[PDB]
Amino acid sequence: MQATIYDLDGNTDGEVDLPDVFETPVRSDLIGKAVRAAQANRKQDYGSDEYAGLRTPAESFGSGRGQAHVPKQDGRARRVPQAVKGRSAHPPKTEKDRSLDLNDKERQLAVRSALAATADADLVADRGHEFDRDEVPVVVSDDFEDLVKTQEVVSLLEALDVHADIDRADETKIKAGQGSARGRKYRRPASILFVTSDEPSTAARNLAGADVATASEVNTEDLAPGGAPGRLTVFTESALAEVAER
Amino acid sequence: SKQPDKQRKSQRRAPLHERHKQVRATLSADLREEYGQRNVRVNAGDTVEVLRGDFAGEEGEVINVDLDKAVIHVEDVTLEKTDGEEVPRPLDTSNVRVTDLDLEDEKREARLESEDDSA
Amino acid sequence: TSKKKRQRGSRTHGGGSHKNRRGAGHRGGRGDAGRDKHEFHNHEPLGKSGFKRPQKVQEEAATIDVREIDENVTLLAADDVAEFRVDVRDVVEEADDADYVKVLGAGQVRHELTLIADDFSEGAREKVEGAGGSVELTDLGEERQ
Amino acid sequence: SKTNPRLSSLIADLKSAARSSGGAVWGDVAERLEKPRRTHAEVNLGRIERYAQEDETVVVPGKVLGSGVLQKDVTVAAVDFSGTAETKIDQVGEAVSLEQAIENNPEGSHVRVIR
RNA sequence: UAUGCCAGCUGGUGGAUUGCUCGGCUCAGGCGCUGAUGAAGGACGUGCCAAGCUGCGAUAAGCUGUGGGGAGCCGCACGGAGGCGAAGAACCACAGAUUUCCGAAUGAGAAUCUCUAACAAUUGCUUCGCGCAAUGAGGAACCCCGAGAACUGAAACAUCUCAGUAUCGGGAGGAACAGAAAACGCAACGUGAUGUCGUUAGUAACCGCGAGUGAACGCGAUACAGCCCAAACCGAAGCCCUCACGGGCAAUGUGGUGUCAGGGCUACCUCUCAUCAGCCGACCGUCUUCACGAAGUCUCUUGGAAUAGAGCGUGAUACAGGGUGACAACCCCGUACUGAAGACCAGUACGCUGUGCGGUAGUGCCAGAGUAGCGGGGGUUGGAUAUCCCUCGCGAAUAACGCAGGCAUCGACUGCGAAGGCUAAACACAACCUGAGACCGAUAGUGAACAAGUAGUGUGAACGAACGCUGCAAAGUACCCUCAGAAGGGAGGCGAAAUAGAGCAUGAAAUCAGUUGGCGAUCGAGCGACAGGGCAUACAAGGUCCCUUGACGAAUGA
RNA sequence: UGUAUGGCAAGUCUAACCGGAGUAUCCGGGGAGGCACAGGGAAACCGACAUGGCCGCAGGGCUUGCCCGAGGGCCGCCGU
Ligand SMILES: [Cl-]
Ligand SMILES: [Cl-]
Ligand SMILES: [Cl-]
Ligand SMILES: [Mg+2]
Ligand SMILES: [Mg+2]
Ligand SMILES: [Mg+2]
Ligand SMILES: [Mg+2]
Ligand SMILES: [Mg+2]
Ligand SMILES: [Mg+2]
Ligand SMILES: [Mg+2]
Ligand SMILES: [Mg+2]
Ligand SMILES: [Mg+2]
Ligand SMILES: [Mg+2]
Ligand SMILES: [Mg+2]
Ligand SMILES: [Mg+2]
Ligand SMILES: [Mg+2]
Ligand SMILES: [Mg+2]
Ligand code: NA
Ligand code: NA
Ligand code: NA
Ligand code: NA
Ligand code: NA
Ligand code: NA
Ligand code: NA
Ligand code: NA
Ligand code: NA
Ligand code: NA
Ligand code: NA
Ligand code: NA
Ligand code: NA
Ligand code: NA
Ligand code: NA
Ligand code: NA
Ligand code: NA
Ligand code: NA
Ligand code: NA
Ligand code: NA
Ligand code: NA
């Protein structure tokens, strides 16, 4: 198929062939598996102290005093799991393998599939993204990489009738729960993914919900955050071309 | 760090000289333009305007600046005790704006006027 | 919902009487305990059998059946096409860490082939010569006399 | 509890064809696909070559693999083919998806099931 | 109707629950020795008032210098009094001063004191004098060298296993240890110091051949580095102390040469850039700290308070996180970008000074002994005839020799020189610094969010808790009455709220006081389920229900 | 050792580790090695049906009982 290139003013400036990978049949089950693995693989090992509750010489008196056979120290129960201050019977363990493997082929297929979901306006709309456009992904000239100011990227996005998505992501959510006590108070919608070629867009990165990436290493997660296919993306002329052989 | 416990901790345990930054207030439009700074460390000679509490809108001279509790006393911003005595209502500098500066100190003035440093 | 997930409330978690799941007695001893007594069933009988020759006196032959060679003659375009002529050593994988390459005769030979290897089975020869081909024994192959 | 949405759609399409049209093979192929993956067909070319006949579409209720040689000019229809299988088959005949088979022959006539 | 039963209401009691996090737990990066120049630890002191903690040491919450920092300050700790600071204090960094007693504890003795100059004790050097030096002890674990169980498993148990584990003795470092082949033995026309990681592989090997046990070569990686003696041949050409003088060491050999690319010697060729000694001496990176750092505190409404809703506007290489009277990119700290310093890498790499590599021919000059090896007895190992070690006895050759290649002997072949020594880097731990989290969230998580190894128990070794939350701001309740009264109560005052009033957010259940509805002093006990009646009931969140008659009308059926 | 789902398929998967980067995630590289592709025999050593016959389910075909009949079943034959 064909993809309409846009200059830094938002006007049409020719067009190139949309590479074959964007025709890869959308596979949400494979995309979800790739994201699930990437998410698991960055989780940190944890577990309670191996000796927690065991630092005591507490002994049970056995039969005789009308008491349950429970280890006691200074007239206070200890060690056993049913005892307050006792050990945790089956606690989290550091030794546990919290990683998920994934065949390279299966993962690479998910990358291609997530890439292809990006070329479907309906899917992108179902994912939640706000925009007034028919063609997708949004292809732009390589000059986008030379932009420096965030506001300039804004103007271009408004000129591309795609800025409404950033308006959507411009709302943080103060999460329910104790994640707040561990530094996870906020969360926000995922908006536009900017795929460049030489370096991630420093100018577009701070945009609400935006993620920047490069064609050589863009992954399933940035292409389909949370395992959901069809992220509103904007490739760079060269990025579009590079992504073709992934 | 990004961790909340560590952030609050470093703010509550900061050594005396690091507490000066906890008693900073935004400068008025005129003062910002004049010295090229958005805010300043409120001093006990400055005049300030309350922008947020029950005293919002009132102006007065800063009478005291406590580094430990990171709070300031502004003239007439008070509370009436039971016995009738009038005691100051502690204010957080964040709810205040500096409209006039006490520049009797050569060092403070120099710090304000210099462009490579902020007071 | 998994089996495990449905155990809360069952008391015994599928173990039958609560007197069951205790120590090793419930297994008749730890590991292979009783493999000759109460649990001899389905264990290989006790005893010694045979001998082993030292590992460095053992030879490992890299084999391949004529069927594999023959099924890919056209596909092996990067290998001699005479009046096909293929050196088996250049075909078999794992042919380096092997003491020698041997051609076995499983399958058919639908082409006239000229095979070069260190050894061949009587059946591999009959098949290669039967389809109007030849079998060339390598210099290493000169160990049969 | 199939997980692949495409395999799931194929199965539903196979049923629709067996019901609407006269096809009995499609519904038969649908039932085998609904069964566990371990039971699905895994056929090499040597088997297709041995039991196929020209102008009779070979139907594999699974996947076609590339071992062996195919010389017959047959049309093979499967859920999927390995890269090599599809290459060998197209040299002497034609590799086709079950999705195309259902469209070109909804009545499922002149077909041979091979597993 | 008393005594009383059930449910609720008001108020207690209690501290669950929800929300909150100054603490934990775990992972990761960095970094890493201290002590006779008396450490670590402890004791006792030290403040205006000072009990605890912290700090400090008779100069006692501190003294001095430099740099930073800045108008405030006098630790935790918000009192009273008083004081310090523009003579630039507080505070932070680096460096210095002071630094009681006990403590390895060292003049001697002693439960932290005492008695009449002290390296006690053991050593090296030695001016043979404690003159110059060393050792001792500590440290979270890691590391190296020794000693070495049992419960347990084998469904008993003895070999085996647990296990060279626990525990004990000795000792080093920032890392240890190992290490330049008498190797390997995919047997080769092959590899080429050593650790470590992945694999080889639960393979080979062991084993009441039961249960169990269990490598290596090689390969892919990480990091890479290779050298010095003894002797031959020389023979005082040498070394240490001292400013010097002078002294000490050394023919029982200091020093030169030399170290399997064997060397020495004799005769030659050529040459050095090898090696060794020494000088200089980083970049980058990484860790931590610091400087600078954009943009609203506009309108209306609600509110005690706007960070809320509606409206208008702004920055962004900064929309991580935190604070601020409620949900904050633009109010404050920060955050992106840029820059600076210290530490580590490292006295390393690079560069340089000096030395001089190597080759031919001749020469039986040299080349590590209770050794190699054998036997007796044990331990250990996967090591089986073929692991490594100990002990007692025996015991060789000399490169023209010797050892190894998984039984012994002889020959061949291939590899390799033991009985002297050193050696960077890659790897272990986590005290210390910093960062992180699908970890816990106050009966959890450390024993320990609090006075925590605290209070307290035991002669002692040792054992060992519980206790988090007023409020936006103390505005922490003036005055009056009552009272034995700084109690308490009444009235009153503050605040959005006192049912936020001090172990004070919320405030469950068990349960208690008062009280409401129902039952109740002639009556029977799993306390109820299902039916059906009495009596009782503010709203809300349910709106149905009763009787005449009529329609429909299964089985059944006058 | 099974099972369900998914990728690839006569193959399949990388381990340690290396480079990149948005720096524990992630992208690229790495096939050392493992299992599978031949078995039998203590060992020496030797080394197999890409189909020869008959039944026949599903399915297909036909002129509607008759053919073709993967899989399956019964035999042959082959390696040791
Ligand atoms: Cl064998
Ligand atoms: Cl097959
Ligand atoms: Cl080798
Ligand atoms: Mg606990
Ligand atoms: Mg909750
Ligand atoms: Mg300034
Ligand atoms: Mg290989
Ligand atoms: Mg003494
Ligand atoms: Mg036993
Ligand atoms: Mg037994
Ligand atoms: Mg053992
Ligand atoms: Mg070996
Ligand atoms: Mg020398
Ligand atoms: Mg043993
Ligand atoms: Mg606790
Ligand atoms: Mg006792
Ligand atoms: Mg309360
Ligand atoms: Na304890
Ligand atoms: Na009891
Ligand atoms: Na783990
Ligand atoms: Na069971
Ligand atoms: Na049980
Ligand atoms: Na057993
Ligand atoms: Na028996
Ligand atoms: Na350190
Ligand atoms: Na005190
Ligand atoms: Na001191
Ligand atoms: Na000494
Ligand atoms: Na002396
Ligand atoms: Na037993
Ligand atoms: Na016993
Ligand atoms: Na044994
Ligand atoms: Na090899
Ligand atoms: Na504020
Ligand atoms: Na011996
Ligand atoms: Na050897
Ligand atoms: Na508590
Ligand atoms: Na391989």
B115 CA to centre of ligand 6 in angstroms: 4
Structure tokens that stand for D50 in this block: 């041995």
**Three-class DSSP category at A11:** coil
What CATH number does residue C11 fall under? 4.10.990.10
Q: How far is the CA of B101 from the C1' of E258 (A)?
A: 86
Asked if residues D11 and D3 have their Cβ atoms less than 8 Å apart, the reply is: no
C25 CA to centre of ligand 32 in angstroms: 24
Across the interface, do A27 and D3 touch by the CB < 8 Å criterion? no
Find how far residue A177's CA is from the centre of its chain: 20
Q: Which residue, D105, D115, D114, is CA-closest to D24?
A: D105
Instruction: Compute and round to an integer the Cα radius of gyration of chain A.
Output: 26
Place of tokens 């009587």: C122
What CATH number does residue C110 fall under? 3.100.10.10
Asked if residues C89 and C116 have their Cβ atoms less than 8 Å apart, the reply is: yes
**Hey, where are the domains in chain A?**
1-246
C42 and C107 assigned to the same domain = no
User: Which chains have at least 3 CB atom pairs separated by less than 8 Å from chain A?
Assistant: B, D
C140 CB-near residues (< 8 Å, 6+ apart): C100, C118
Q: How far is the CA of D89 from the C1' of E420 (A)?
A: 77
Q: Which residue, D61, D73, D74, D52, is CA-closest to D25?
A: D61
Instruction: Give start and end residues of each alpha helix (H) in chain A.
Output: 28-40, 104-117, 121-127, 150-159, 164-169, 220-223, 237-243
Written as one letter, the residue type at D40 is H
Q: Is B25 exposed, middle or buried (0-12, 13-18, 19+ CB in 10 A)?
A: buried
The answer to whether the C-beta of A167 is closer than 7 A to strand E is no
Q: Rounded distance, CA C136 to CA A240, Å?
A: 55
D104 CA to centre of ligand 13 in angstroms: 95
Kindly report the nearest CA distance between residue B13 and chain A, in angstroms.
Answer: 19
Q: Are strands B71-74 and B59-66 parallel, antiparallel or unpaired?
A: antiparallel
Angle between helices A104-117 and A28-40 (to 10 degrees): 120
Q: Rounded distance, CA C82 to CA C84, Å?
A: 5
Q: Are strands B24-27 and B96-100 parallel, antiparallel or unpaired?
A: parallel
A236 CB-near residues (< 8 Å, 6+ apart): A139, A140, A141, A142, A144, A145, A195, A196, A197, A215
Domain encompassing residue C59: 51-144
The answer to whether the C-beta of C35 is closer than 7 A to strand E is yes
Structure tokens that stand for A99 in this block: 């990683």
Secondary structure letter of residue A226 according to DSSP: G
Q: Which residue, D115, D5, D2, is CA-closest to D60?
A: D115
Structure tokens that stand for B33 in this block: 């333009």
Q: How far is the CA of C30 from the C1' of E35 (A)?
A: 54
Q: In this complex, how many residue pairs, one in chain A and one in chain D, have their CB atoms less than 8 Å apart?
A: 8
Q: Chain A residues with CB inside 8 Å of D3's CB?
A: 29
Which helix (H) or strand (E) segment holds residue B33: the answer is: helix B29-35
Q: Rounded distance, CA A232 to CA A119, Å?
A: 9
Q: How far is the CA of A119 from the C1' of E558 (A)?
A: 83
Dihedral over alpha carbons C30, C34, C35, C41 (to 10 degrees)? -110
Asked if residues B72 and B50 have their Cβ atoms less than 8 Å apart, the reply is: no
Residue of B nearest to A181 (CA): B4
Q: Rounded distance, CA A232 to CA A121, Å?
A: 9
Angle between helices D5-20 and D25-34 (to 10 degrees): 150
Written as one letter, the residue type at A8 is L
C81 and C116 assigned to the same domain = yes
**Three-class DSSP category at B101:** coil
Instruction: Give start and end residues of each alpha helix (H) in A128-244.
Output: 150-159, 164-169, 220-223, 237-243
Q: How far is the CA of A82 from the C1' of E450 (A)?
A: 26
Q: Which neighbouring-strand residues pair with B63?
A: none
Find how far residue B34's CA is from the centre of its chain: 19
C105 and C116 assigned to the same domain = yes
D32 CB-near residues (< 8 Å, 6+ apart): D39, D40, D41, D61, D62
C88 and C116 assigned to the same domain = yes
Q: How far is the CA of A49 from the C1' of E445 (A)?
A: 10
Asked if residues C63 and C94 have their Cβ atoms less than 8 Å apart, the reply is: no
Using CA atoms, how far residue A68 sits from A57, A75, B55, C85, in Å, is 18, 13, 65, 87
Q: Chain A residues with CB inside 8 Å of B8's CB?
A: none
Ligand index nearest the alpha carbon of residue A53: 4
Across the interface, do A185 and B4 touch by the CB < 8 Å criterion? yes
Asked if residues B68 and B22 have their Cβ atoms less than 8 Å apart, the reply is: no
Asked if residues A16 and A139 have their Cβ atoms less than 8 Å apart, the reply is: yes
Structure tokens that stand for D52 in this block: 């196929």
Nucleotide nearest to B105 (CA to C1'): E86
Asked if residues A149 and A186 have their Cβ atoms less than 8 Å apart, the reply is: no
A65 CB-near residues (< 8 Å, 6+ apart): none
Q: Which residue, C29, C48, C47, C49, is CA-closest to C39?
A: C29
Q: Record the resolution, in angstroms.
A: 2.4
**Around ion ligand 1, which residues have CB less than 5 A away?**
C 52-53
Reported as half-sphere exposure (CB side, CA atoms, 13 A), residue B93 has a value of 27
Does the CB of A174 have a partner CB in chain B at under 8 Å? Answer: no
Ligand index nearest the alpha carbon of residue A46: 20
Structure tokens that stand for B24 in this block: 């900073």
Fold of the domain built from segment(s) A1-246? Ribosomal Protein L4; Chain: A; (3.40.1370)
Q: Chain A residues with CB inside 8 Å of B4's CB?
A: 180-183, 185
Q: Rounded distance, CA A57 to CA D90, Å?
A: 78
Instruction: Compute and round to an integer the Cα radius of gyration of chain D.
Output: 13
C43 and C59 assigned to the same domain = no
The answer to whether the C-beta of B13 is closer than 7 A to strand E is no
Q: Rounded distance, CA C16 to CA C145, Å?
A: 70
Q: Which residue, A106, A138, A113, A104, is CA-closest to A20?
A: A113
A61 CB-near residues (< 8 Å, 6+ apart): A67, A69, A72
For D1-115, CATH number out of 3.40.50.2300, 3.100.10.10, 3.30.470.20, 3.40.50.720 equals 3.100.10.10
Omega prior to A137 cis, within 30 of 0? yes
- How many domains are contained in chain C? 2
For strand E, the positions having any atom within 7 A of a protein Cβ are 19-23, 25-27, 68-74, 76, 78, 86, 88, 90-92, 153-156, 185-187, 204-205, 209-212, 290-295, 297-298, 304-307, 315-325, 327-329, 331-334, 336, 406, 434-441, 443-448, 453, 456, 462-466, 472-478, 492-494, 496
Using CA atoms, how far residue D34 sits from B55, D27, D76, in Å, is 74, 10, 21
Place of tokens 């479907």: A120
Asked if residues D48 and D74 have their Cβ atoms less than 8 Å apart, the reply is: yes
Residue of A nearest to B1 (CA): A183
Q: Chain D residues with CB inside 8 Å of A28's CB?
A: 5
C29 CA to centre of ligand 31 in angstroms: 14
Asked if residues A96 and A90 have their Cβ atoms less than 8 Å apart, the reply is: no
The answer to whether the C-beta of A207 is closer than 7 A to strand E is yes
Structure tokens that stand for A139 in this block: 């292809």
- Domains, chain B, ranges and CATH? 1-119 (2.30.30.30)
B62 CA to centre of ligand 36 in angstroms: 92
Does the CB of A184 have a partner CB in chain B at under 8 Å? Answer: no
The answer to whether the C-beta of B44 is closer than 7 A to strand E is yes
Q: Rounded distance, CA A139 to CA A122, Å?
A: 17
Structure tokens that stand for A64 in this block: 């005789």
Dihedral over alpha carbons A212, A213, A218, A219 (to 10 degrees)? -30
